[PDB]
Amino acid sequence: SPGIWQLDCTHLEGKVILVAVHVASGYIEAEVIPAETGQETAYFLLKLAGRWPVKTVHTDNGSNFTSTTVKAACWWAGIKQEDGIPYNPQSQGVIESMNKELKKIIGQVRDQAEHLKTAVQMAVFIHNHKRGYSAGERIVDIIATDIQ
Amino acid sequence: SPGIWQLDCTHLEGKVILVAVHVASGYIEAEVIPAETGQETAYFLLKLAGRWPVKTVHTDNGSNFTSTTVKAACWWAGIKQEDGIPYNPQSQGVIESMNKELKKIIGQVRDQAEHLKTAVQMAVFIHNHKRGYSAGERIVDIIATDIQ
Ligand SMILES: CN(Cc1ccccc1C(=O)NCC1CCCCC1)Cc1ccc2c(c1C(=O)O)OCCO2
Ligand SMILES: CN(Cc1ccccc1C(=O)NCC1CCCCC1)Cc1ccc2c(c1C(=O)O)OCCO2
Ligand SMILES: [Cl-]
Ligand SMILES: [Cl-]
């Protein structure tokens, strides 16, 4: 559980927002890309695994589960690649709610930048800092406890 | 000290590698950009502060210290912007050694990707995982202790 992440893809302004969520804490990382490809997903995972101890990634769809480039990034980074089937149905709702919340925050900051990528990083900041612990505090505490 | 980071700019393949180092742990984040501008530095700091609790950033040069866009990103993210003058002379050497080490790692992975950005993220991964604790373990432990 300290090492489990979930990929999530949502759309805004004709672009794709790729999100990785640390399941146990709700902490997120995100980026803006023109379209979701295996190559871009692979690169996103390489970045993620260099920054946090990623043991397992539940992929966001079957195309990314199948992608040889995504499989190659998971091999490279020592990540167990898994499907994202919501065997627990509450998983769908949680991700849906998170996407709605993210878009709401993006709307609240949207006029503070020209480019969507900038607004998305402001939204990541606000989400991770919101408290009563924050998601950012929770992920560090969870991982630190696991190390000790 | 848990919240203190240092910016660092190095060059490879006619491009710029922008690095943020967590001073107490040696943990790094990095990106590749065509050239170091205030805007790109500002965006890099916004990303960093959404991911880690950044209290203070020592800027890499006077242009980034002066930059109104960098100052604006520091204001936005609640970061104290400081100079990077090595009042302790060993600071120069440490950064110089880190850049040499990074470039060595990049050379060791360079043929595993077409694009420099990919090789840089592999290098970040290897640096942060190298042990006997790793930099990634150190940063989490330092910040977790501070939270509690
Ligand atoms: C040049 N932009 C001016 C601007 C334009 C429109 C509205 C507000 C502002 C404004 O000054 N925002 C306040 C402040 C908020 C904290 C972050 C820094 C900007 C901002 C900007 C800076 C660096 C970038 C950008 C962008 C962008 O416009 O998206 O895009 C990606 C590449 O790095
Ligand atoms: C398409 N590339 C094929 C390739 C080309 C040359 C040498 C090796 C390989 C190769 O297959 N490497 C193994 C593996 C290593 C772990 C990561 C996934 C690739 C790799 C690649 C994937 C995603 C990207 C890339 C790149 C890139 O080439 O830089 O660039 C930035 C955008 O996301
Ligand atoms: Cl798409
Ligand atoms: Cl430059």
The ranges assigned to domains in chain A are 1-148
Q: Which two tokens stand for residue B132?
A: 């006997």
Angle formed at CA B127 by CA A16 and CA A70, multiple of 5 degrees? 35
Give the closest-approach CA distance of A92 to chain B in angstroms. Answer: 25
Resolution in angstrom units: 1.8
Q: How far apart are CA B137 and CA B127, in angstroms?
A: 12
Method: X-ray
Pairing status of strand A15-22 against strand A28-33:
antiparallel
Q: Which of A3, A129, A57 is nearest to B51 (CA)?
A: A129
What does the alpha-carbon distance between residue B72 and residue A75 come to, in Å, rounded to a whole number? 40
CA–CA distances in Å: residue B8 to residues A33, B20, B97, B142:
26, 6, 12, 22
Residue B39 near ligand 1, beta carbon < 6 Å:
yes
What spacing in Å lies between the alpha carbon of A7 and ligand 1's midpoint?
A: 27
Report the residue of A125, A137, A145 to disrupt the B interface, i.e. the one with the largest count of B CBs within 10 Å: A125
Distance CA A33, CA A117 (A): 9
CA distance B114 to B79: 35
Report residue A39 as tokens: 């190559």
Q: Is A16 helix (H, G, I), strand (E, B) or coil?
A: strand
Asked if B143 lies within 8 A of A140 by C-beta distance, the reply is yes
Q: Is A111 helix (H, G, I), strand (E, B) or coil?
A: helix
Question: How many whole angstroms separate alpha carbon A12 and alpha carbon B101?
Answer: 40
Cα dihedral across residues B118, B120, B126, B129: positive or negative: negative
**How many other C-beta atoms are found inside a 10 Å radius of the C-beta of residue A118?**
21
3-state secondary structure chain B: CCCEEEEEEEEECCEEEEEEEECCCCCEEEEEECCCCHHHHHHHHHHHHHHCCCCEEECCCHHHHHCHHHHHHHHHHCCEEECCCCCCCHHHHHHHHHHHHHHHHHHHHHHHCCCHHHHHHHHHHHHHHCCCCCHHHHHHHHHHHHHC
Determine the topology of domain A1-148 in CATH.
Answer: Nucleotidyltransferase; domain 5 (3.30.420)
In the three-class reduction of DSSP (H, G, I as helix; E, B as strand; rest coil), residue A9 is classed as: strand
Reference A116, options A12, A40, A23; nearest CA is A12
In chain A, % helix, strand, coil (3-state, to 5) comes to 55, 20, 25
Enumerate residues 6+ apart whose C-beta is below 8 A from B55: B2, B3, B4, B79, B80
Distance of CA B92 to the CA centre of its chain: 14
Residues of chain A contacting B134 with CB distance shorter than 8 Å: none
Selection from A147, A103, A138, A126 nearest residue A26 by Cα:
A138
| CA A56 to the chain's CA centroid | 13
Residue whose entry in the numeric block shows the structure tokens 């090492």 = A3
